[PDB]
Structure 1
Amino acid sequence: YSFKDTSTGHKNKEFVARIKSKLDQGGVIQDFINALDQLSNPELLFKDWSNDVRAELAKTPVNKKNIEKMYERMYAALGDPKAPGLGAFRRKFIQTFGKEFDKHFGKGGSKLLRMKLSDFNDITNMLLLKMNKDSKPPGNLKECSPWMSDFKVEFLRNELEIPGQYDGRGKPLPEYHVRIAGFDERVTVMASLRRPKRIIIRGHDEREHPFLVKGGEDLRQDQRVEQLFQVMNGILAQDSACSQRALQLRTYSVVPMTSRLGLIEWLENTVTLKDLLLNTMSQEEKAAYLSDPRAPPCEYKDWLTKMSGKHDVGAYMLMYKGANRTETVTSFRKRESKVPADLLKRAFVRMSTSPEAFLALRSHFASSHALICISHWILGIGDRHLNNFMVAMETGGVIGIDFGHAFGSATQFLPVPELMPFRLTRQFINLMLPMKETGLMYSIMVHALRAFRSDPGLLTNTMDVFVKEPSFDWKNFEQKMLKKGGSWIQEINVAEKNWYPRQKICYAKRKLAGANPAVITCDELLLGHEKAPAFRDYVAVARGSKDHNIRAQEPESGLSEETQVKCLMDQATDPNILGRTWEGWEPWM
């Protein structure tokens, strides 16, 4: 908060103190947060503290009081092992990490309290490198944060009321909202870069509720974009021509319990898109798709080797200094022609039992996927890779999850950018044969984008929570934009109020008032890859050709709606873009 305290700062201070005393009702909520914190891997917070000390001491030793304010949390968690037992209940794995890390932290506590070294990091990097041998994240039970496993409610401690309820509309009548009464022994770890956990908590009426717990990321961006989706299907179901089609985005609840601790509602009876495709295939198909040098797995890497000589990241940089246009299309169609041409069709006749009903599962799938690919562009979300789309195996509809790059941020700070606006690849148009992606995945996009260009004020007005309070993900990269970037046509001294967020709201207001979707994809590429080695080839690929693409025969602004979605779909499916992208996005399937 950090009040100013000139005239009314005192009454604001005592008012916040009044509420801080009025809430929290003793000791169930704060140690709920705490004992949920104390089960994650200590390596993630270890590298987090390493990042925040390398970024704030190793560059300039003038930042007064910030190191002495940030070593308090490093002293608390992974410090002296009775401090976790004082602040909360001590776990069963910090008593094996602090039991090992005593010699290494003796010199830390005795001289790295006020170190002022700023030049060497390998003395710590070798210990975090060797520490990943006796790091076992599976605690194999629920005793690994032993307050929830010994919860055992006994009296009116002002119940907790399992979070992620109170969805806005309606006088709530809170006697129905479920209350926590236990946890299960079997916990699971996920499959991501830092592997968040998945818990099986129980309601007060013997109902399982699973949740996804992640303990290092500030989940306020996700809360604001699910807030945006609530505005989005509040403006959809008011519109006339979209309500007959009954168009709605399907959301899900995410609560930021505190900074570096949030909960995600895990959804049930759903399966990811890659698992659906990879299990519709036959047993003679999958092994030859996986383990062939002519399979599109290894053929792309051999193309990376034979195109520019490099064998790793940066080959995509030297590929823009490699092939020409009419090499990539011909080397790409033979990559597209190695997977079977129908997999969603086999997956929709494998489960629909009737020719009346195959027709009506397919229209629902295609209309829902059209809706999320047009609403994933206004607020411009990138990284639409294969495990981000989640189909619902009881009604046939896709749900979109895992939002990392919210506004135009996939094509700015990533090494090799992503230039498509969404994911409309080959299988999504082979589903609709003998037609193609012009009948049903077109008028849905026109109706949705016409509703969003009806009243252009609502989403930009909701976007101002980002400018009234910047999050942690919009200040760790704001420094990178400050040290290298653009935006010198605007001022810098009013930072984070009209420099950064008025830029993002300016971009979304441009593409909501009518902008060429090749212009934005190179403006956001100029503002993050100016003075690049291969920058003219980026702005040459993502601009058109004027002989083969309609996105080069149209002006930049004042553009119309049907024309805008037309050049959008032209930018979406084009083998020039999809021939040279990131190898984990899998643009061929």
Structure 2
Amino acid sequence: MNGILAQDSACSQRALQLRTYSVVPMTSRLGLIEWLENTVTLKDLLLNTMSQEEKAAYLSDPRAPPCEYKDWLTKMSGKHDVGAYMLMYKGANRTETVTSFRKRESKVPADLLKRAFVRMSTSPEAFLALRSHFASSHALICISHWILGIGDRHLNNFMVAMETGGVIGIDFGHAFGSATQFLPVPELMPFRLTRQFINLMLPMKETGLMYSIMVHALRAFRSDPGLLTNTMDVFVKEPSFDWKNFEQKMLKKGGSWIQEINVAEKNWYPRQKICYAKRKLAGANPAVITCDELLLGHEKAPAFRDYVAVARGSKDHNIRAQEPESGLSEETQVKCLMDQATDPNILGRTWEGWEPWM
């Protein structure tokens, strides 16, 4: 990807790149990841910014978002486990989620990331430059991850450097829609773009820099689907990337999976992955791809209709259903992506470990 983007002129004038750290399995059990200097998780940067009372309430308060959300799931479903999400997709409409979800979001400190930056920078150049750098990098990674369908983008999978504002993606345990496909609680966003990101740009919403870069990137890729498509097809056809390797990762997710039941092993459909990748690179609607992945993964679930109704949206508030299912341009695709990733109806139904409120 960095090869392509180095060769796209409109991106090269923006010096755009992902960072990679070299990775070396020496054995099927064992390997090294190269480490990175003066880096933290995004979660740690955030909670390092909360005052004692902000921090202390946020840990445990029955009205802090972590308690208030499980309580809302609990009353909107009557259960206290993974099935509470399932039942709430049947049980809560838009209004019932939006209301609690706005009340929830309100309790998150609005400035927090900005507050972090302004007190890790000398002077306003050391503010502006970092904000630009972060913003560029966050956008660039988001589009990239949608192309690869990477789904498990919670706060601990993003690292922020100190020596520059360039964000770094890690923990790629879910290639090609695997999280939206096989988890009991499906995660429906194309990438993370929650409140704090927008708030960092508060006067000057995403339709500036992020939107611009996202658009340049997607065009630069779509200039040459061939090489990237061939590489992804070689990826998805590896004999070590079957379902047996995958489900023996899915165990290792802290009870968020279907715990010790229903592997349903004729579950693996490798050509559909590269087919959906080619559809994305051809100009397909992101909501249609999400609905297709939902149909492939959860077809017999009692909330499949509600799943696709939430993922597709309504023609009244979200512009991803007011567009065709294919032939979209790069700008329309990025608009649909930003509408789906910031949809409150989708964020109000997300798994609690993803932390959609922050």
Q: TM-score scaled by structure 1?
A: 0.57
Q: Deviations over 1:120-158 (max 9, x none)?
A: xxxxxxxxxxxxxxxxxxxxxxxxxxxxxxxxxxxxxxx
Q: 1:478 to 1:309 in 2, by over 3 A?
A: closer
Contact 2:242 2:268 in 1 (8 A): no
Contact 1:237 1:247 in 2 (8 A): yes
Q: Does residue 424 of structure 1 match 2:193?
A: yes
Q: 1:276 to 1:480 in 2, by over 3 A?
A: closer
SS in 1 for 2:266: coil
Question: How much identity, in percent, do the aligned residues show?
Answer: 100
Q: Deviations over 1:227-261 (max 9, x none)?
A: xxxxx111111111111111000001111212222
Q: Does residue 588 of structure 1 match 2:357?
A: yes
Higher mean displacement: 493-502 or 243-252: 493-502
Contact 1:412 1:529 in 2 (8 A): yes
Q: 1:577 to 1:252 in 2, by over 3 A?
A: same
**Partner residue, 1:490:** 259
Structure 1 residue 331: Cα displacement: 1.2
Structure 1 residue 288: Cα displacement: 1.6
Contact 1:487 1:527 in 2 (8 A): no
Q: Deviations over 1:308-350 (max 9, x none)?
A: 1001110011001111112211111000000110011111110
Q: 1:485 to 1:289 in 2, by over 3 A?
A: closer
Structure 1 residue 578: Cα displacement: 0.3
**Structure with greater contact order relative to length (CA < 8 Å, sep ≥ 6):** 2
Q: Deviations over 1:49-90 (max 9, x none)?
A: xxxxxxxxxxxxxxxxxxxxxxxxxxxxxxxxxxxxxxxxxx
Q: How does 1:269-284 map to 2 (within 5 A)?
A: 269-284=38-53
Q: 1:512 to 1:280 in 2, by over 3 A?
A: same
SS in 2 for 1:316: helix
CA distance in 2, matches of 1:480, 1:289: 31
Q: 1:493 to 1:587 in 2, by over 3 A?
A: closer
Structure 1 residue 546: Cα displacement: 0.5
Contact 2:319 2:339 in 1 (8 A): yes
**Partner residue, 1:546:** 315
Contact 2:97 2:345 in 1 (8 A): yes
Structure number with larger C-alpha Rg: 1
SS in 2 for 1:533: coil
Q: 1:289 to 1:417 in 2, by over 3 A?
A: same
Structure 1 residue 382: Cα displacement: 0.5
Q: Does residue 341 of structure 1 match 2:110?
A: yes
CA distance in 2, matches of 1:235, 1:492: 43
Q: Deviations over 1:183-235 (max 9, x none)?
A: xxxxxxxxxxxxxxxxxxxxxxxxxxxxxxxxxxxxxxxxxxxxxxxxx1111
Q: 1:588 to 1:430 in 2, by over 3 A?
A: same
SS in 1 for 2:31: strand
CA distance in 1, matches of 2:69, 2:260: 44
Greater share of residues in helix: 2
Q: How does 1:21-60 map to 2 (within 5 A)?
A: none
Structure 1 residue 486: Cα displacement: 26
Higher mean displacement: 420-429 or 237-246: 237-246
Q: 1:504 to 1:485 in 2, by over 3 A?
A: farther
Contact 1:485 1:529 in 2 (8 A): no
Contact 1:578 1:587 in 2 (8 A): yes
Q: TM-score scaled by structure 2?
A: 0.92
Contact 1:370 1:441 in 2 (8 A): yes
SS in 2 for 1:399: strand
Contact 1:516 1:564 in 2 (8 A): yes
Q: Over aligned residues, Cα RMSD in angstroms?
A: 5.1
Q: 1:494 to 1:285 in 2, by over 3 A?
A: closer
Contact 1:490 1:499 in 2 (8 A): no
Structure 1 residue 481: Cα displacement: 14
Contact 1:486 1:530 in 2 (8 A): no
Q: Does residue 321 of structure 1 match 2:61?
A: no
Structure 1 residue 277: Cα displacement: 0.5
**Partner residue, 2:142:** 373
SS in 2 for 1:565: helix
Contact 1:485 1:530 in 2 (8 A): no
Higher mean displacement: 432-441 or 385-394: 432-441
Q: 1:315 to 1:361 in 2, by over 3 A?
A: same
CA distance in 2, matches of 1:292, 1:483: 28
CA distance in 2, matches of 1:292, 1:484: 25
Q: 1:565 to 1:326 in 2, by over 3 A?
A: same
Aligned length: 358
